[PDB]
Amino acid sequence: MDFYYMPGGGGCRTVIMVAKALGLELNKKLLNTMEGEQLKPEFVKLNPQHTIPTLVDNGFSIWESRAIAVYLVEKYGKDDYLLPNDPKKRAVINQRLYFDMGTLYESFAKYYYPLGSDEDLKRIETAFGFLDTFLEGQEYVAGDQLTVADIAILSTVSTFEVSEFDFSKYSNVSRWYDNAKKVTPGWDENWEGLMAMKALFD
Amino acid sequence: MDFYYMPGGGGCRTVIMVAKALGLELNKKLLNTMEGEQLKPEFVKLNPQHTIPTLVDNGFSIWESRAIAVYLVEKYGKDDYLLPNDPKKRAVINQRLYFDMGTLYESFAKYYYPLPGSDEDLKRIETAFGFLDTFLEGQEYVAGDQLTVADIAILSTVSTFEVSEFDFSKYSNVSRWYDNAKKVTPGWDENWEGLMAMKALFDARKL
Numbered sequence A: 001m002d003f004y005y006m007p008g009g010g011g012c013r014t015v016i017m018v019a020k021a022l023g024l025e026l027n028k029k030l031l032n033t034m035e036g037e038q039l040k041p042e043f044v045k046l047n048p049q050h051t052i053p054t055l056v057d058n059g060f061s062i063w064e065s066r067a068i069a070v071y072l073v074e075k076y077g078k079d080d081y082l083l084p085n086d087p088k089k090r091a092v093i094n095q096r097l098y099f100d101m102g103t104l105y106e107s108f109a110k111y112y113y114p115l116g117s118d119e120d121l122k123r124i125e126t127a128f129g130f131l132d133t134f135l136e137g138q139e140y141v142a143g144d145q146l147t148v149a150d151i152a153i154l155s156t157v158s159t160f161e162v163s164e165f166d167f168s169k170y171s172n173v174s175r176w177y178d179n180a181k182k183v184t185p186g187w188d189e190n191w192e193g194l195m196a197m198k199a200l201f202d
Numbered sequence B: 001m002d003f004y005y006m007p008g009g010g011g012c013r014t015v016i017m018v019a020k021a022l023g024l025e026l027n028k029k030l031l032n033t034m035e036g037e038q039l040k041p042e043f044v045k046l047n048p049q050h051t052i053p054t055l056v057d058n059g060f061s062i063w064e065s066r067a068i069a070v071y072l073v074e075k076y077g078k079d080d081y082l083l084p085n086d087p088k089k090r091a092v093i094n095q096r097l098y099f100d101m102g103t104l105y106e107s108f109a110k111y112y113y114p115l116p117g118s119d120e121d122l123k124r125i126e127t128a129f130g131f132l133d134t135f136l137e138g139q140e141y142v143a144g145d146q147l148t149v150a151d152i153a154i155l156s157t158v159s160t161f162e163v164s165e166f167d168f169s170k171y172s173n174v175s176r177w178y179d180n181a182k183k184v185t186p187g188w189d190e191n192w193e194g195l196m197a198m199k200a201l202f203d204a205r206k207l
């Protein structure tokens, strides 16, 4: 399956980790969006929104990182790995995925993409507080086992770590993060993508 | 099923329409965020993020409008109604839901919440509608040829734009789709009611 991507991006790194966890091979096609490579007509035919990540899986084109992630698990995941069958448990996972996009990652973008006001820094703190509460009394963000929601939020929180946002006062988040780093497949490739992204801005 | 909401909100109205499509009664609990009612400790205990909509279904508290919508369909939907089983068709629906949140509704929020908004933010709306128009090329619905939760969520958003007097008549697939959506989507009447207070409210504040 073809994976149109940039290695530093959080959405791209989420899919990378999910694919590694599922033991799936990605044929990586680096599209430099800083050089408008995502506007090539061959790519636009696959994804008319011409966004990355985009995965092409035997003729099937899908984009939005969190949609890709859930698709790979629903198609290739064995048993209840990373995603259960239960509507209730699945709903919590889905709410955490929208949290990750609309609240947690959104606060990252608002504060670091103007590379940032005190107000937007407060927005990050507020988001981390919610995540900390989400993690009260459980090892993972949506329950008792690693899910796609953990992997997505790891992608985001590791971006914060490398950008040097200090979340050490968030006891649950810090404990979750250390565990997630050890148990999540593909962390090494997440870290590589982050490290270049850091060396980039640095 | 307790439904914590405001009638004007796009996310609240998505849930209202899905609940109607599914035959589900909501016990509506109006939670007015302009008076911090959602910050009250009793609500925070139900939803630590204290956002609306929040659904409490027989002890289970769930929030994020699009998560609530999918939960209702997965738990209560018959057959393949509103959400087919096929991982591929479900994936396209999920992509359209994230589109709705992060691109389409996002462009509404950035332009209209101040109302300033800037010309760049207006352009972002046009860009978002352009993509939606392309998604609808040759297609009756946003994610295939049946009504889905993605249509209902995007209908909530596009109807918000209409009542805010954004002209999308130049997007002819979106316009066609919208006119059809209004006729075939359950709960349209309640969505409109939520919008029209919104208009009347906005109009009166403008003087």
Ligand SMILES: [K+]
Pocket (backbone or CB within 6 Å): A007, A189, A192
């Ligand atoms: K690599």
Ligand code: NA
Pocket (backbone or CB within 6 Å): A011, A051, A052, A053, A054, A063, A064, A065
């Ligand atoms: Na994408």
